[PDB]
Design a protein around this ligand. Structure first.
Ligand SMILES: *[C@@H]1O[C@H](CO)[C@@H](O[C@@H]2O[C@H](CO)[C@@H](O[C@@H]3O[C@H](CO)[C@@H](O[C@@H]4O[C@H](CO)[C@@H](O[C@@H]5O[C@H](CO)[C@@H](O)[C@H](O)[C@H]5NC(C)=O)[C@H](O)[C@H]4NC(C)=O)[C@H](O)[C@H]3NC(C)=O)[C@H](O)[C@H]2NC(C)=O)[C@H](O)[C@H]1NC(C)=O
Ligand code: 6OU
Ligand code: 6OU
Ligand code: Y01
Ligand code: Y01
Ligand code: Y01
Ligand code: Y01
Ligand code: Y01
Ligand code: Y01
Ligand code: Y01
Ligand SMILES: *[C@@H]1O[C@H](CO)[C@@H](O[C@@H]2O[C@H](CO)[C@@H](O)[C@H](O)[C@H]2NC(C)=O)[C@H](O)[C@H]1NC(C)=O
Ligand code: NAG
Ligand code: NAG
Ligand code: NAG
Length: 1395
């Protein structure tokens, strides 16, 4: 505390504190007195800096918990540092000046500034893949600087000698090997071993030991992942169950292919002859790839099958199983490990479509249902559980921080001082001159007028630059020339014209003036290069003007807030993410550098894309693996690198990166968040229409009354709704038979023609009855009738058109597509549908408020893309060589390859998706944001060259940055904003109603809370014992945990048994393993029998016992089936369907492991919140399929359209919609409907129906796909929200926590002390002394006897006090009216009263 210490004062205390073992002592719970934990300022008592007393050891003026032999020092920033004043043997004592010099070296900030200048330097020189040798010398220097950093600490803190040593801190040795390796090579000669010295990357983790904010956020992440549990166990268990299921369905099923016909051996020792070619052996014909058939349009082996729904190849080929697995042989169902990888592939949702088609072709259509299950249980439920647990773990930290902060709180900037000379020179800008115009301008700035017009100037100009298309043929080039000048001048006119009105002493107030000044300086500086027309990209920074439309917007400021939060408030975590990405990008190169040298050997040395021979491609590949695409680049491993390393690298990258990104996303969100009926109508204008209120005392008025009552009776009857439902369902189903059957069958044609007419007749009759039953109240008190009217009018129009032979015109024939709206009339006839639509219609403003912002933000980047990439995507190609581009020595520009068109084999093509207009830019950006189909777009962009020039390989490798920026800005923050607004409005909507009852019907609302509880009364124990020899010990056998040990042992051994399975194996193991199966079934059956009469016949309860009989029956009937039908086995499908019954008997272990029960419970409580959403999704999908079958019937089979995936029939349309409902690839489906060119479109087509051509109309297709994508996303988001919230609803925890059972014992003992009289009346005059013996008094003692009279102690009869009026009074003193034990006790006391 003071300047210096004496030699004896320290001894005076270090001798006294050492006497604890002898005299000091013959509860502490050490805590930082003022949250002192080093590396923190924490001014506690002084609050001011000393004169010169800082920087020296102190005696720690606090409790003697940190005095001992240690001391505390502070730097110029009052940073606490604790050191130990101990020796290091030999001639070394703390009373030396060298230790003081070391403290001065260490505490001061200067030291930090040195070390950083090294670390970042060392982060550059290891970024090269071929360094010159003289870099060894720089390495030398680096080593020295780290020797220093170590030596001062080693001398100051001690190696491991006494306490607070160098190695006591866990971080200090994390770089200890740094000092080893750099010396190890110096004295020890090195061998000829590679794959070594990639350890240097560990060095850059020292950056964390420097910026303390990084250490705090690292600790927070570690705590979150240590609080995340009881999810991975469910994930691996469910994945293993699904893998076991799939190993029994698609085994060996991915090698089916059809080969050119096998003829015979021709009756000799052996000769396989075919078209004059001879083969020696069968394996030389079955394993020869020259006989394989290739799927035209791609590069792979066609798959096939013998099934009735599998498909066939052209004639001359026979289907069979032979060869190797497809796609480099890394996808398989032959063994458990490959099935496990395939399912983890499905879990993450990447490159599924292809696997889906490959499995579907060989298995057949009927197996699609399997995938339908695997997605739903896989992608949604587990991911929701992970998100919920992470969210809770993060909320806890903020809550604890706020609580601790509240508890703790409850306990000049003039360095130069020259600018003031300007303050006494400025301000008075009026001068002797002015005194008129100055106030004139100040008045002329009119907020209700000028502030509006300037706003229009910002708007109109932003639209004027949207007309920047391709080949104006001028007129627009000079018109934009004039406009961008007039607009810039008007915009910058007020720049300095506002100074006279607003004194420059107040020139800068809020910073919006700073932003406007920066924009003006931008424009002026840009308009400084007129001598040239080149460098037009320079003129693109004017799109910054669009941010001026921020001050008049209620949600753009919101966005600017989120942005600011992420950059600065959350910088401490984004820097960590950047460091992690850099570390992984560097380590990948060192791990797999020298492996792609031999990957060329073609086309004069071109290299395949996405390599790791350079830093930029490493960053790109890490970005892709962080964006959720990893199979495509993983499959480039296992070929050069091997199987043992790429797997681990990719898997840990996936975990680390996804966890960090999700935590940052949640952090950013939480930061940003903080009797006569009515005749016509009311008594208004009806005073001039005595048209219904007429005399009814005679015949003329009875008609209206009787007709209205009869119609009312008709509509209320339930059988009328039954009739309506049946007709509506039949109407919806009738439309499913409009496929190519129309020109193939005849009676179904006449049937449907009659049916449509009768349907329209009945519907119009409904409408006529409706317009009378309820008067005119409808259409104005219930809007649902508007949809009915808008639908029925369509059919009436078509009927009147076709009746008179006037429906041969295109507008009328095209009106037949509006019949696809027929199923929508059933939306209002079911309760769950009404609930979900009424809940969904409550967020349209929420949708629009994000739609506007996203639209503007995306237009900003669309304009840039148009200005950069326009007019560079064309090329010319040879017909017979496919669509591949040519070289750059024969053709250079479009005119040249059009002039070389002498043979007619040269054709000009343009990329389907381009940047030639704003609209196409919108479509391209939508494709890039969704992550499907962007590869070809970036292939076009990277390969770009000058205007109208043939592309060259990788001429501009830096175009990736623009797409990277757009993905990071248009996907992360947009999702943030959308989630924020939708959740906020949805919760406010729930808050308005008063309860949590949303998405539930009237019965479900009550059943959800009626069928959910969590309480127990008294379970017991039965065990018959009229025979002490057998069952008395059977009871001991069952009650012990040895029964649990037996069950787990047996089921785990069966698990291990059923983990030996492969393809066709030697018969010896086939039979022995069947012996093992028989033994396991027998021992399980024996265990279920030995259960016997332990509970007699009273064990048939809800406990987990009847499932023993269930599994015994199922397993025995699935196992003895082989003996039942031993005669023949000709059912290579149904037998396998029975054999899955072994999947069971493995779900018996969910009975245990209590923690894997509540999560499952929440799901069964949550399914009814998903049924209605599934129904709505089904209806939407059916409507879209019906609409889609009508326009794409004859689209050419190109790209994703094949024989098994088209729109010719209902089934194929449903399959395609199922494929695209999750946006799992739609570019390949949209692609073959944009073709219009004669090369790609045959106008004349000899079809067999009322249609011509095989190419669709894009103007319908783009809308059809975009609307489905957006609707599917909205519904999936709603399902996500419901599932997450249901998992938070199950957090009751100590909702009751009675613990009241124990107490009744003292009351019963007092009763026994009071029982023999059996009067049940007590007097307080004796209870005053009686209650003093209460064990741990929960009631009144003797001094409190006077108060007991006033606390529920009634006097009845002759001033008598009842005992039954005291039990609940005592009970509520600890707990009451909350727990189930209290309610049971009070009800038992009431029953005793009734007794
Ligand atoms: C769709 O419908 C198709 C009907 O046209 C159907 O093809 C039929 O499939 C059956 C069963 O899959 C096949 O029956 C063949 O019958 C012959 C004569 O009995 C048998 O050939 C023997 O096969 C064994 C292998 O199981 C050979 O042993 C070893 O084979 C390997 C590889 O072939 C080779 O190294 C050697 O040949 C030998 N090993 C050694 C060390 O020597 C055995 O040699 C031959 N026999 C002879 C004389 O060579 C066998 O039962 C079977 N042949 C097979 C399976 O290759 C046959 O393909 C079709 N039926 C007929 C009557 O011709 C097709 O399978 C259906 N689609 C699907 C997906 O199932
Ligand atoms: C974070 C890291 C924090 C520190 C952790 C590990 C570093 C361990 C460094 C070595 C410490 C060894 C101390 C030790 O053995 O002390 C001995 C302690 O003996 C005891 O009575 C044991 C008491 C155990 C209490 C808990 C000790 C925990 C030690 C860290 C784990 C002293 O005996 P001795 O003088 O060697 O004579 C022995 C025969 N009578
Ligand atoms: C999302 C809303 C967009 C809907 C489609 C708008 C344009 C569809 C195509 C109409 C033609 C078109 O783009 O015209 C172009 C005009 O640019 C536009 O798309 C208009 C700009 C609209 C700004 C935002 C509203 C120029 O075509 P050209 O080169 O003269 O031939
Ligand atoms: C993550 C934040 C902290 C930025 C860190 C960036 C630097 C650590 C790295 C990243 C990219 C590196 C550059 C990538 C490429 C080169 C080219 C290189 O010279 C060559 O042209 C190499 C020969 C060849 O191109 O084949 C000189 C170093 C330099 C500028 C590198 C210097 C170090 C840089 C700037
Ligand atoms: C080959 C060698 C160099 C590998 C070295 C790696 C590990 C030994 C290091 C690297 C990061 C370290 C961790 C970084 C941060 C923390 C959080 C930190 O959290 C706390 O301080 C919590 C409160 C408490 O002290 O109990 C505890 C130590 C720990 C797990 C560290 C333990 C040691 C780790 C795992
Ligand atoms: C967690 C982040 C921050 C860093 C991850 C780094 C690892 C991916 C790297 C760093 C050092 C590498 C190791 C460096 C040296 C070797 C020795 C090498 O030994 C052998 O087996 C070669 C000889 C033989 O095959 O017999 C095997 C690879 C291995 C373990 C490497 C595996 C990959 C490691 C662990
Ligand atoms: C596609 C990848 C990048 C994940 C994007 C996250 C979203 C799927 C959204 C949908 C529902 C959201 C959750 C809805 C409700 C909650 C509860 C509440 O805490 C606010 C955040 C959180 C976890 C949300 C986190 C982000 C979620 C999971
Ligand atoms: C979003 C991108 C396109 C901006 C490109 C330029 C930026 C690198 C710079 C240029 C001018 C800078 C601005 C200049 C002046 C200010 C005022 C400054 O105000 C204050 O510090 C106090 C604010 C208050 O009084 O509350 C805040 C930062 C800000 C907006 C700066 C933010 C960063 C800007 C926009
Ligand atoms: C803006 C954010 C999203 C960038 C994130 C990645 C950066 C940390 C790294 C990755 C690749 C690096 C680049 C790799 C190679 C070059 C060499 C060299 O390039 C040029 O010749 C200039 C190109 C330019 O103007 O960007 C200058 C540094 C640069 C752009 C590097 C700068 C730093 C980059 C962009
Ligand atoms: C400034 C704000 C408003 C928008 C930021 C958008 C960036 C993502 C864009 C705008 C300017 C672009 C740069 C403009 C010019 C070039 C030079 C270009 O280099 C060449 O063309 C070299 C070949 C040659 O010309 O000989 C490489 C891309 C790069 C760095 C571009 C990379 C992407 C940038 C940074
Ligand atoms: C475009 O493709 C055709 C067809 O492959 C190429 O024509 C080749 O050469 C003559 C014509 O000069 C044909 O008779 C041959 O059949 C073709 N193949 C071979 C191997 O000669 C033609 O050269 C290609 N390029 C151009 C510019 O037409
Ligand atoms: C068939 O040919 C093989 C080898 O060519 C020969 O070993 C075998 O004996 C022949 N079988 C006969 C001749 O029956
Ligand atoms: C391409 O393959 C399909 C297979 O369904 C076939 O129908 C078609 O004829 C093939 N194309 C040509 C040009 O033969
Ligand atoms: C090719 O083999 C199949 C197999 O059934 C057969 O039906 C067909 O006739 C064979 N083709 C010829 C040309 O013999």
């Amino acid at each position: 505390s003071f300047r210096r210490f004496t030699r004896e004062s320290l001894a005076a205390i270090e001798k006294r504190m050492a006497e604890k073992q002898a005299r000091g002592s013959t509860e502490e719970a050490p805590r930082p007195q003022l949250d002192l934990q080093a590396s923190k300022k924490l001014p506690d008592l002084y609050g001011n800096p000393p004169q010169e007393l800082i920087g020296e050891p102190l005696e720690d003026l606090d409790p003697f918990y940190s005095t001992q032999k240690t001391f505390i020092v502070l730097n110029k920033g009052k940073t606490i540092f604790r050191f130990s004043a101990t020796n290091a043997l030999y001639v070394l004592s703390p009373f030396h000046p060298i230790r003081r010099a070391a403290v001065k070296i260490l505490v001061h900030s200067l030291f930090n500034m040195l070390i950083m200048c090294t670390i970042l330097t060392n982060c550059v020189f290891m970024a090269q893949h071929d360094p010159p040798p003289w870099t060894k010398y720089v390495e030398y220097t680096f080593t020295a600087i780290y020797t220093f950093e170590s030596l001062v600490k080693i001398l100051a803190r001690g190696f491991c000698l006494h306490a607070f040593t160098f190695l006591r801190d866990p971080w200090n040795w994390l770089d200890f090997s740094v000092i080893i390796m750099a010396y190890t090579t110096e004295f020890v000669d090195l061998g000829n071993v590679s794959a070594l010295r990639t350890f240097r990357v560990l060095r850059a983790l020292k950056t964390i030991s420097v910026i303390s904010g990084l250490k705090t956020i690292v600790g927070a992440l570690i705590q979150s992942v240590k609080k995340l549990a009881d999810v991975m166990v469910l994930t691996v268990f469910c994945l293993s169950v699904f893998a076991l299921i799939g190993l029994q369905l698609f085994m060996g099923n991915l090698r089916h292919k059809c080969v050119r016909n096998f003829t015979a051996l021709n009756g000799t020792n052996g000769s396989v002859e075919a078209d004059g070619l001879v083969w020696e052996s069968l394996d030389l014909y079955l394993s020869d790839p020259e006989n394989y058939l290739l799927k035209n349009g791609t590069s792979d082996v066609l798959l096939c099958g013998n099934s009735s729904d599998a498909g066939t190849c052209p004639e001359g080929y026979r289907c069979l199983k032979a060869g190797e697995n497809p796609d480099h042989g890394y996808t398989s169902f032959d063994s458990f490990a490959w099935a496990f990888l395939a399912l983890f592939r499905l879990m993450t949702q990447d490159c599924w479509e292809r696997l889906y088609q490959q499995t579907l072709r060989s298995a057949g259509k009927i197996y699609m249902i399997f995938f339908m299950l695997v997605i739903f249980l896989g992608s949604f439920y587990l991911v929701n559980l992970i998100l919920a647990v992470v969210a809770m773990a993060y909320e806890e930290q903020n809550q604890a921080t706020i609580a601790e902060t509240e508890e703790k709180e409850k306990r000049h900037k003039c360095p130069p001082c020259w600018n003031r000379l300007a303050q006494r020179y400025l301000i008075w800008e009026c001068c002797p001159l002015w005194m008129s115009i100055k106030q004139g301008v100040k008045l002329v700035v009119m907020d209700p007028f000028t502030d509006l017009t300037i706003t229009m100037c910002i708007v109109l100009n932003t639209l004027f630059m949207a007309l920047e298309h391709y080949n104006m043929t001028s007129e627009f080039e000079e018109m934009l020339q004039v406009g961008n000048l007039v607009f810039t001048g008007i915009f910058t006119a007020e720049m300095t014209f506002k100074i006279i009105a607003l004194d420059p002493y107040y020139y800068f107030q809020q910073g919006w003036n700073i932003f406007d000044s920066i924009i003006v300086i931008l424009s002026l500086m840009e308009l400084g290069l007129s001598r040239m027309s080149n460098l037009s990209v320079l003129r693109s920074f004017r799109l910054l003007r669009v941010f001026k439309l921020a001050k008049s917007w209620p949600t753009l400021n919101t966005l600017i807030k989120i942005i600011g939060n992420s950059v600065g408030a959350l910088g401490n975590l984004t820097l960590v993410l950047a460091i992690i990405v850099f570390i992984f990008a560097v380590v990948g190169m060192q791990l797999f550098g020298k492996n792609y040298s031999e990957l060329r050997d073609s086309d004069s040395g071109l290299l395949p894309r996405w390599h790791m021979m350079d830093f930029f491609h490493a960053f790109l590949i890490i970005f892709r693996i962080l964006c959720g695409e990893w199979i495509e680049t993983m499959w480039d491993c296992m070929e050069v690198s091997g199987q043992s390393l790429c797997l681990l690298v990719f898997l840990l990258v996936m975990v680390i990166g996804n966890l960090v990104v999700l935590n940052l996303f949640l952090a950013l969100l939480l930061s940003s968040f903080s009797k006569d009926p009515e005749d016509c109508f009311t008594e208004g204008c009806v005073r001039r229409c005595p048209c219904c209120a007429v005399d009814t005392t005679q015949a003329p008025g009875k008609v209206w009354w009787r007709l209205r009552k009869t119609c009312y009776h008709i509509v209320e009857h339930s059988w009328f709704e039954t009739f309506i439902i049946f007709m509506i369902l039949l109407s919806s189903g009738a439309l499913a038979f409009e496929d190519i059957y129309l020109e193939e069958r005849k009676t179904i044609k006449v049937l449907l023609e009659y049916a449509d007419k009768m349907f329209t007749y009945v519907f119009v009759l409904e409408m006529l009855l409706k317009w009378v039953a309820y008067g005119f109240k409808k259409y104005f008190t219930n809007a649902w009738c508007w949809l009915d009217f808008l639908i029925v009018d369509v059919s009436l129009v078509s009927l009147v058109a076709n009746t008179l032979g006037f429906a041969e015109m295109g507008p009328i024939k095209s009106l037949r597509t509006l019949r696809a709206l027929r199923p929508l009339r059933a939306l209002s006839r079911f309760e769950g549908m009404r609930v979900v639509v009424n809940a969904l219609v409550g967020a349209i403003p929420s949708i629009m408020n994000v739609l506007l912002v996203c639209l503007i933000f995306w237009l900003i980047f669309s304009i840039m893309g148009v200005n950069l990439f326009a007019g560079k995507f064309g090329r010319c190609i040879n017909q017979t060589e496919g669509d591949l581009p040519l070289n750059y020595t024969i053709v250079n520009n479009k005119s040249q390859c059009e002039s070389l068109n002498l043979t007619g084999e040269l054709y000009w093509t343009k990329v389907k998706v381009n940047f030639d207009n704003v609209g196409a830019g919108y479509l391209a950006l939508l494709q890039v944001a969704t992550f499907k189909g962007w590869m070809d777009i970036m292939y076009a962009a990277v390969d770009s060259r000058g205007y109208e020039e043939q592309p060259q390989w990788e001429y501009n490798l830096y175009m990736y940055i623009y797409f990277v920026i757009f993905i990071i800005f248009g996907s992360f923050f947009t999702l943030n904003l959308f989630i924020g607004v939708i959740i906020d409005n949805f919760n406010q909507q729930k808050k308005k109603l008063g309860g949590q009852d949303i998405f539930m019907t009237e019965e479900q609302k009550k059943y959800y809370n009626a069928m959910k509880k969590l309480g127990s009364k008294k379970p017991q124990k039965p065990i018959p014992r009229p025979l002490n020899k057998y069952q008395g010990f059977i009871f001991d056998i069952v009650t012990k945990q040895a029964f649990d040990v037996t069950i787990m042992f047996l089921i785990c051994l069966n698990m291990v048994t059923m983990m030996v399975e492969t393809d066709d194996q030697s018969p010896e193991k086939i039979n022995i393993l069947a012996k093992i199966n028989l033994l396991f079934v027998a021992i399980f059956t024996g265990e279920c029998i030995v259960k016997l009469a332990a509970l007699r016949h009273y064990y048939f309860t809800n406990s987990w016992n009847i499932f023993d009989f269930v599994v015994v029956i199922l397993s025995i009937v699935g196992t003895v089936l082989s003996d039942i039908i031993q005669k023949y086995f000709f059912s290579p499908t149904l037998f396998r369907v029975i054999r899955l019954a072994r999947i069971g008997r493995i779900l018996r272990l969910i009975r245990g492991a209590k923690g894997i029960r509540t999560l499952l419970f929440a799901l069964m409580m949550s399914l009814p919140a998903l049924f209605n959403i599934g129904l709505l999704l089904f209806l939407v999908m059916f409507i879209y399929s019906i609409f889609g079958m009508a326009n794409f019937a004859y689209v050419k089979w190109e790209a994703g359209i094949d024989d098994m995936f088209n729109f010719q029939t209902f089934a194929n349309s449903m399959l395609c919609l199922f494929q695209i409902t999750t946006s799992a690839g739609w570019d390949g489906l949209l692609s073959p409907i944009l073709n219009t060119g004669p090369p790609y479109c045959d106008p004349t087509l000899p079809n067999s129906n009322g249609s011509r051509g095989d190419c669709g109309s894009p103007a319908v297709g783009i809308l059809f796909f975009t609307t489905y994508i957006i609707i599917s996303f909205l519904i999936v988001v709603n399902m996500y929200i419901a599932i997450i919230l249901e998992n938070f609803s199950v957090a009751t925890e100590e909702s009751t926590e009675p613990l009241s059972e124990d107490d009744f014992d003292m009351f019963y003992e007092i009763w026994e002390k009071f029982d023999p009289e059996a009067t049940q009346f007590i007097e307080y005059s004796v209870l005053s002394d009686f209650a003093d013996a209460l064990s741990e008094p929960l009631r009144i003692a003797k001094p409190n006897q006077i108060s007991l009279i006033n606390m529920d102690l009634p006097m009845v009869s002759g001033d008598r006090i009842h005992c039954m009026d005291i039990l609940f009074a005592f009970t509520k003193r600890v707990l009451g009216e909350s727990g189930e034990m209290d309610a049971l006790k009070i009800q038992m006391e009431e029953k005793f009263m009734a007794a």
